[PDB]
From a paper:
In order to identify novel CARF effectors, we used Foldseek18 to search for proteins with structural homology to CARF domain of the Cam1 effector. This method rendered a 600-residue protein containing an N-terminal CARF domain followed by a linker region and a C-terminal adenosine deaminase (ADA) domain, with accession number HAJ98955.1 from an unknown Bacteriodales bacterium (hereafter named CRISPR-associated deaminase, CRISPR-associated adenosine deaminase 1 [Cad1]), for which homologs were already identified in a previous bioinformatic screen. cad1 is located immediately downstream the cas10-csm genes of a type III-A CRISPR locus. Further analysis of cad1 homologs showed that over 70% associate in genomes containing type III systems (mostly belonging to the A and B subtypes) and exist within many unique phyla of bacteria. These data suggest that Cad1 is a widespread effector in type III CRISPR-Cas systems. Altogether, these data demonstrate that Cad1 deaminates ATP molecules to ITP through the formation of an hexameric complex that requires a Mg+2 or Mn+2 cofactor and an activating cA4 or cA6 ligand. While the triggering of a growth arrest in the host is a common strategy of all CARF effectors, we believe that Cad1 introduces a new mode of defense for CRISPR-Cas systems that couples nucleotide deamination activity to a sequence-specific, RNA-guided adaptive immune response.
To further test this finding, we purified a hexa-histidyl-tagged CARF domain (residues 1–185, Cad1-CARF-His6) and tested the binding of different cOAs using isothermal titration calorimetry (ITC). We found that Cad1-CARF-His6 binds to both cA6 and cA4 with a kD of 30 and 700 nM, respectively. We also co-crystallized cA6 and cA4 with Cad1-CARF-His6 and solved the crystal structures at 1.8 and 2.4 Å resolution, respectively. While cA6 binding produced a minor change (from 58° in the apo structure to 55°), cA4 binding opened this angle to 76°, most likely a consequence of the deep burial of cA4 within the pocket. The Watson-Crick edges of several adenosines of bound cA6 and cA4 form intermolecular hydrogen bonds group of charged residues within the pocket, including K104, that account for the specificity of cOA recognition. Superposition of the structure of this domain within the hexamer with that of the cA4-bound Cad1-CARF-His6 showed good structural correlation (root-mean-square deviation [RMSD] 2.8 Å), with a 3 Å upward shift of the ligand and a decrease in the angle between the C-terminal legs (57°) in the cryo-EM structure. We believe this shift could be due to either the truncation of the full-length Cad1 protein in the case of the crystal structure, crystal-packing forces, or some combination of these factors.
Residue numbers in the entry:
A (entry chain A), B (entry chain B): 2 to 165
Write the structure that this text describes.
RNA sequence: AAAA
């Protein structure tokens, strides 16, 4: 199974855009984000539940709305890394999109990909930042969505073993 | 010399906020950004023109307006790391603010700090994102500007010698 | 998705 791992922020369209980084799409899409109300899950649940062959989940860093100090970041990172281990497939490395969330959320996800492994680690950028699924598809058909591979990450099998 | 190194984006207020990460201020602030016309330095230059004793410079990634693909990122990263070596002080590590620019710009800056060294690597966060100098001074008074330390970076003395 |  191809599995996509993503952080999310306010812009609802980055995870859907990231879902199109690969022609086949993805079998599983998993999101990690804060408890902030600046993240609205409804658009994500609507779109991904309407796709037939896709397992979708949103995991919140429970009790944390914002990363405002060092303890917040540490708590977020601990929850993200355990989440990464839980959601990644058993016989393959996941795909990882970094574009969602705040910079430090994204950098923590990059570090996780480096330690545990990622088949692909990528940014998605949009010329005109589509606001909804219809504009996303319009942007895709016009070649206005760009995917930037930051690099394959082998990770350490000695760390992937720890998921048990 | 306390020196601040910063990526810059379209929110012109992150660098003047970062200037206040340390009570004694910075003797030098150096900014690196893209060559896109969507970069308006005016409010940035206003702030440091009212601190004429601070050494201040803006360096552009000549020819690169955006990071749209892997070659764009790689060219950005090579100039950024050259500039980091050029700007960092001779006998102590610089301070590094990560909050400006797009995520990939910021990740490349953090990698440079990891490699060449940084006394401090921090994000600057604002409760309500000032848009102008007066709003920022108000937010600083009221403690609405937050600073997150991501970590001291010793770097490698063997790489620092290469500024020769 | 250039302070989410």
């Amino acid at each position: 199974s191809r599995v996509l791992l993503c952080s999310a922020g306010h812009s609802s369209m980055v995870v859907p855009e990231a879902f199109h980084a690969v022609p086949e799409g993805f079998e599983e899409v998993h999101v990690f984000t804060t408890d902030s109300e600046k993240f609205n899950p409804v658009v994500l649940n609507d779109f991904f539940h309407s796709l037939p062959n896709v397992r979708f989940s949103i995991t919140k860093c429970h009790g944390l709305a914002d990363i405002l100090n060092e303890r917040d970041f540490e708590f977020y990172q601990e929850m993200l890394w355990q989440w990464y281990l839980t959601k990644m497939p058993d016989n393959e490395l996941p795909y990882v999109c970094l574009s969602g969330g705040i910079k430090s959320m994204s950098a923590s996800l990059q570090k996780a990909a480096t330690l545990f492994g990622a088949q692909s680690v990528f940014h998605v950028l949009a010329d005109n930042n589509p606001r909804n699924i219809e504009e996303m598809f319009d942007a895709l058909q016009k070649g206005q969505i760009h995917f930037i591979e930051m690099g394959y990450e082998p990770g350490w099998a000695a760390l992937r073993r720890l998921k048990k």
